Design a protein around this ligand. Structure first.
Ligand code: A1I9F
Ligand code: GDP
Ligand code: MG
Length: 166
Protein backbone atom coordinates (compact mmCIF):
# COMPACT_ATOMS: atom_id res chain seq x y z
CA UNK A 1 0.00 0.00 0.00
CA UNK A 2 1.39 3.43 -0.99
CA UNK A 3 0.12 6.96 -0.36
CA UNK A 4 1.27 10.00 -2.40
CA UNK A 5 1.19 12.99 0.00
CA UNK A 6 1.94 16.56 -1.08
CA UNK A 7 2.92 19.39 1.28
CA UNK A 8 1.82 22.85 0.13
CA UNK A 9 1.63 26.36 1.51
CA UNK A 10 3.47 29.68 1.53
CA UNK A 11 7.21 30.15 1.62
CA UNK A 12 8.72 29.77 5.05
CA UNK A 13 5.81 28.04 6.80
CA UNK A 14 7.82 24.92 7.60
CA UNK A 15 6.97 22.50 4.75
CA UNK A 16 10.52 21.23 4.53
CA UNK A 17 11.04 21.19 8.29
CA UNK A 18 7.85 19.13 8.79
CA UNK A 19 8.91 16.74 6.00
CA UNK A 20 12.38 16.32 7.41
CA UNK A 21 11.01 15.67 10.90
CA UNK A 22 8.81 12.88 9.53
CA UNK A 23 11.49 11.35 7.27
CA UNK A 24 14.82 12.07 8.98
CA UNK A 25 13.67 12.62 12.63
CA UNK A 26 15.53 15.91 13.23
CA UNK A 27 14.77 19.61 13.08
CA UNK A 28 16.59 21.12 10.11
CA UNK A 29 16.86 23.65 4.29
CA UNK A 30 17.34 25.45 0.89
CA UNK A 31 14.08 27.21 0.46
CA UNK A 32 14.07 26.75 -3.33
CA UNK A 33 14.40 22.97 -3.43
CA UNK A 34 11.43 20.70 -4.23
CA UNK A 35 12.10 17.05 -3.42
CA UNK A 36 10.41 13.78 -2.55
CA UNK A 37 10.99 11.18 0.09
CA UNK A 38 9.59 7.77 1.00
CA UNK A 39 9.05 6.30 4.43
CA UNK A 40 7.55 2.96 5.48
CA UNK A 41 5.13 3.42 8.43
CA UNK A 42 2.43 1.43 10.27
CA UNK A 43 -0.79 3.46 10.78
CA UNK A 44 -3.75 1.84 12.53
CA UNK A 45 -2.14 -1.53 11.97
CA UNK A 46 -1.63 -1.10 8.24
CA UNK A 47 1.90 -1.02 6.82
CA UNK A 48 2.27 1.50 4.05
CA UNK A 49 4.73 3.53 2.11
CA UNK A 50 4.35 7.26 2.31
CA UNK A 51 5.73 9.18 -0.66
CA UNK A 52 5.99 12.85 0.41
CA UNK A 53 6.45 15.67 -2.04
CA UNK A 54 7.80 18.81 -0.31
CA UNK A 55 6.87 21.64 -2.70
CA UNK A 56 8.97 24.69 -3.53
CA UNK A 57 9.90 26.98 -6.39
CA UNK A 58 8.56 29.85 -8.40
CA UNK A 59 4.82 30.29 -8.69
CA UNK A 60 4.24 28.75 -12.15
CA UNK A 61 1.28 26.95 -13.71
CA UNK A 62 1.74 24.61 -16.65
CA UNK A 63 0.50 21.24 -17.90
CA UNK A 64 3.55 19.46 -16.39
CA UNK A 65 3.04 21.13 -12.98
CA UNK A 66 -0.74 20.47 -13.00
CA UNK A 67 0.21 16.83 -13.83
CA UNK A 68 2.82 16.53 -10.97
CA UNK A 69 0.22 17.98 -8.52
CA UNK A 70 -2.68 15.82 -9.82
CA UNK A 71 -0.84 12.63 -8.84
CA UNK A 72 -1.07 13.65 -5.16
CA UNK A 73 -3.66 11.61 -3.29
CA UNK A 74 -3.73 13.86 -0.23
CA UNK A 75 -2.46 17.34 0.62
CA UNK A 76 -1.23 19.05 3.75
CA UNK A 77 -2.23 22.74 3.63
CA UNK A 78 0.43 24.29 5.86
CA UNK A 79 0.41 27.79 7.30
CA UNK A 80 2.49 29.23 10.17
CA UNK A 81 0.64 30.51 13.25
CA UNK A 82 2.87 33.64 13.32
CA UNK A 83 2.18 34.57 9.67
CA UNK A 84 -1.31 35.85 8.87
CA UNK A 85 -0.61 36.07 5.12
CA UNK A 86 0.28 32.34 5.03
CA UNK A 87 -3.10 31.57 6.65
CA UNK A 88 -4.94 33.87 4.21
CA UNK A 89 -3.26 32.02 1.33
CA UNK A 90 -4.73 28.64 2.32
CA UNK A 91 -7.83 29.23 0.17
CA UNK A 92 -5.60 29.57 -2.92
CA UNK A 93 -3.83 26.29 -2.36
CA UNK A 94 -7.10 24.42 -1.65
CA UNK A 95 -8.58 25.88 -4.85
CA UNK A 96 -5.58 24.85 -6.96
CA UNK A 97 -5.77 21.28 -5.62
CA UNK A 98 -9.52 21.12 -6.37
CA UNK A 99 -8.84 22.51 -9.90
CA UNK A 100 -6.14 19.93 -10.86
CA UNK A 101 -7.88 16.98 -9.12
CA UNK A 102 -11.26 17.93 -10.82
CA UNK A 103 -13.00 17.11 -7.51
CA UNK A 104 -14.68 18.85 -4.58
CA UNK A 105 -13.57 16.31 -1.85
CA UNK A 106 -9.85 15.76 -2.17
CA UNK A 107 -8.21 14.43 1.05
CA UNK A 108 -6.61 17.40 2.86
CA UNK A 109 -5.51 18.40 6.33
CA UNK A 110 -5.04 21.98 7.55
CA UNK A 111 -1.75 22.29 9.46
CA UNK A 112 -0.89 25.24 11.71
CA UNK A 113 2.86 25.07 12.15
CA UNK A 114 5.40 26.84 14.43
CA UNK A 115 3.16 26.12 17.44
CA UNK A 116 6.23 26.45 19.71
CA UNK A 117 6.61 30.23 18.92
CA UNK A 118 5.16 32.86 21.23
CA UNK A 119 4.50 35.42 18.41
CA UNK A 120 1.11 34.01 17.35
CA UNK A 121 -1.09 36.06 14.95
CA UNK A 122 -3.56 33.31 13.91
CA UNK A 123 -5.74 31.96 16.69
CA UNK A 124 -6.57 28.27 17.01
CA UNK A 125 -10.28 29.12 16.70
CA UNK A 126 -9.82 30.92 13.30
CA UNK A 127 -8.00 27.83 12.01
CA UNK A 128 -10.59 25.38 13.40
CA UNK A 129 -13.35 27.47 11.75
CA UNK A 130 -11.56 27.41 8.40
CA UNK A 131 -11.01 23.63 8.58
CA UNK A 132 -14.71 23.14 9.51
CA UNK A 133 -15.73 25.24 6.48
CA UNK A 134 -13.72 22.86 4.28
CA UNK A 135 -14.86 19.68 6.08
CA UNK A 136 -11.24 18.73 6.91
CA UNK A 137 -9.18 18.15 10.04
CA UNK A 138 -6.98 20.86 11.64
CA UNK A 139 -3.70 19.75 13.34
CA UNK A 140 -1.36 22.11 15.28
CA UNK A 141 2.29 21.29 14.73
CA UNK A 142 5.79 22.30 15.59
CA UNK A 143 8.58 20.98 13.35
CA UNK A 144 10.95 22.27 16.07
CA UNK A 145 9.64 20.15 18.95
CA UNK A 146 7.89 17.49 16.77
CA UNK A 147 4.51 18.31 18.33
CA UNK A 148 1.74 17.02 16.04
CA UNK A 149 4.07 15.93 13.18
CA UNK A 150 3.08 12.23 12.98
CA UNK A 151 -0.52 13.21 13.70
CA UNK A 152 -0.64 15.58 10.70
CA UNK A 153 0.70 12.97 8.22
CA UNK A 154 -1.17 10.04 9.71
CA UNK A 155 -4.45 11.98 9.79
CA UNK A 156 -3.99 12.72 6.09
CA UNK A 157 -3.54 8.98 5.39
CA UNK A 158 -6.80 8.34 7.35
CA UNK A 159 -8.52 11.01 5.17
CA UNK A 160 -7.31 9.21 2.03
CA UNK A 161 -8.62 5.85 3.37
CA UNK A 162 -12.02 7.44 4.09
CA UNK A 163 -12.10 8.86 0.54
CA UNK A 164 -11.30 5.45 -0.96
CA UNK A 165 -14.37 4.00 0.87
CA UNK A 166 -16.82 6.42 -0.76
C1 A1I9F B 1 1.46 24.82 -4.45
C2 A1I9F B 1 0.65 24.50 -5.27
C3 A1I9F B 1 -0.29 23.97 -6.21
C4 A1I9F B 1 -1.27 23.13 -5.70
F1 A1I9F B 1 -1.26 22.90 -4.38
C5 A1I9F B 1 -2.06 22.35 -6.52
C6 A1I9F B 1 -2.00 22.52 -7.90
C7 A1I9F B 1 -1.03 23.40 -8.44
C8 A1I9F B 1 -0.92 23.48 -9.85
C9 A1I9F B 1 0.05 24.33 -10.39
O1 A1I9F B 1 0.18 24.39 -11.80
C10 A1I9F B 1 0.82 25.14 -9.59
C11 A1I9F B 1 0.71 25.07 -8.19
C12 A1I9F B 1 1.44 26.12 -7.47
N1 A1I9F B 1 2.80 26.18 -7.51
C13 A1I9F B 1 3.48 27.13 -6.84
C14 A1I9F B 1 2.83 28.09 -6.10
C15 A1I9F B 1 3.51 29.15 -5.45
N2 A1I9F B 1 4.82 29.13 -5.11
C16 A1I9F B 1 5.48 27.86 -4.70
C17 A1I9F B 1 6.04 27.98 -3.26
C18 A1I9F B 1 4.88 28.42 -2.34
C19 A1I9F B 1 4.87 29.97 -2.35
C20 A1I9F B 1 6.02 30.39 -3.31
C21 A1I9F B 1 5.53 30.38 -4.75
N3 A1I9F B 1 6.85 29.18 -3.19
C22 A1I9F B 1 8.16 29.15 -2.86
O2 A1I9F B 1 8.76 28.05 -2.82
C23 A1I9F B 1 8.85 30.48 -2.67
C24 A1I9F B 1 10.40 30.49 -2.61
C25 A1I9F B 1 11.04 29.51 -1.59
C26 A1I9F B 1 10.82 31.96 -2.29
C27 A1I9F B 1 12.36 32.22 -2.34
C28 A1I9F B 1 12.80 32.69 -3.75
C29 A1I9F B 1 14.24 33.28 -3.75
O3 A1I9F B 1 14.28 34.39 -2.85
C30 A1I9F B 1 14.03 34.00 -1.50
C31 A1I9F B 1 12.59 33.42 -1.37
C32 A1I9F B 1 10.77 30.16 -3.97
O4 A1I9F B 1 11.63 29.32 -4.17
O5 A1I9F B 1 10.17 30.83 -4.95
N4 A1I9F B 1 2.82 30.21 -5.01
C33 A1I9F B 1 1.49 30.22 -5.17
O6 A1I9F B 1 0.79 31.27 -4.70
C34 A1I9F B 1 1.46 32.26 -3.97
C35 A1I9F B 1 0.46 33.41 -3.80
C36 A1I9F B 1 1.19 34.52 -3.01
C37 A1I9F B 1 1.75 35.49 -4.09
C38 A1I9F B 1 0.63 35.43 -5.14
N5 A1I9F B 1 0.16 34.01 -5.15
C39 A1I9F B 1 -1.23 33.69 -5.47
C40 A1I9F B 1 -1.92 33.71 -4.10
F2 A1I9F B 1 -2.05 34.99 -3.61
C41 A1I9F B 1 -0.91 32.94 -3.20
N6 A1I9F B 1 0.79 29.22 -5.68
C42 A1I9F B 1 1.44 28.17 -6.20
C43 A1I9F B 1 0.76 27.14 -6.84
F3 A1I9F B 1 -0.60 27.17 -6.85
C44 A1I9F B 1 -0.23 24.19 -7.60
N1 GDP C 1 10.35 27.74 15.68
C1 GDP C 1 10.07 27.07 14.58
N2 GDP C 1 10.69 27.31 13.49
C2 GDP C 1 10.31 26.51 12.35
C3 GDP C 1 9.34 25.57 12.46
N3 GDP C 1 9.18 25.07 11.14
C4 GDP C 1 10.06 25.69 10.41
N4 GDP C 1 10.76 26.56 11.13
C5 GDP C 1 11.77 27.49 10.60
O1 GDP C 1 11.15 28.40 9.66
C6 GDP C 1 12.01 28.62 8.53
C7 GDP C 1 11.32 28.13 7.22
O2 GDP C 1 11.15 26.72 7.32
P1 GDP C 1 11.13 25.79 6.05
O3 GDP C 1 11.01 24.41 6.50
O4 GDP C 1 12.36 26.18 5.13
O5 GDP C 1 9.82 26.34 5.26
P2 GDP C 1 9.31 26.05 3.78
O6 GDP C 1 9.79 27.31 2.96
O7 GDP C 1 7.78 26.05 4.01
O8 GDP C 1 9.90 24.80 3.23
C8 GDP C 1 13.33 27.89 8.84
O9 GDP C 1 14.17 28.86 9.49
C9 GDP C 1 12.89 26.78 9.83
O10 GDP C 1 13.90 26.26 10.73
C10 GDP C 1 8.65 25.36 13.67
O11 GDP C 1 7.71 24.59 13.78
N5 GDP C 1 9.03 26.17 14.69
MG1 MG D 1 11.08 24.18 1.73
Amino acid sequence: TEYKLVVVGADGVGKSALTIQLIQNHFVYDPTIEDSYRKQVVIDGETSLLDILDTAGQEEYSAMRDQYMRTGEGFLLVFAINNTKSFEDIHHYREQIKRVKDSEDVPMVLVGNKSDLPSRTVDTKQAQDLARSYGIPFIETSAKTRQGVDDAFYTLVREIRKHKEK
